[PDB]
Amino acid sequence: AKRVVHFDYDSSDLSTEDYQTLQAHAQFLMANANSKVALTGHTDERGTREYNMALGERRAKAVQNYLITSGVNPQQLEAVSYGKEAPVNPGHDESAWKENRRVEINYE
Numbered sequence: 001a002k003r004v005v006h007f008d009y010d011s012s013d014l015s016t017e018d019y020q021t022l023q024a025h026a027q028f029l030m031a032n033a034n035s036k037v038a039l040t041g042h043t044d045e046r047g048t049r050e051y052n053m054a055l056g057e058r059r060a061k062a063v064q065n066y067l068i069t070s071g072v073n074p075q076q077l078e079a080v081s082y083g084k085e086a087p088v089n090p091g092h093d094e095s096a097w098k099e100n101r102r103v104e105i106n107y108e
Helices: 016-031 049-069 094-100
Strands: 004-006 037-041 077-081 102-107
Touching (some): 004 016, 016 049, 037 049, 049 077, 049 102
Parallel strands (some): 037 077
Antiparallel strands (some): 004 102, 037 102
16 A cells, blocks of 8 residues: 555544555554564644654654554554654645645655
8 A cells, every 4th residue: 555644734633544554554564574664754834843843753653553553563663753854845835735744654
């Protein structure tokens, strides 16, 4: 499945769609003990760097929580936050911001 899940404004809540994507990664991870993923949290530009750094961390941790709760070994997961510092779209509208509020699933 895809390796990115998105979030709403000032929120670290996951949608039903996101759960489907995450369940696929959980299965792969539980089936491949040598695989490990880095979960990186991100935010759009609104708000201070410190506020976004923490929000990004809550997002990465929410994804982490879903995976662990589903049965994934914590050793195969690492969560980190980049806050607003690594946007995929530097635009200044919802279209751009929606792309930035995310958690990326990176293998290895």
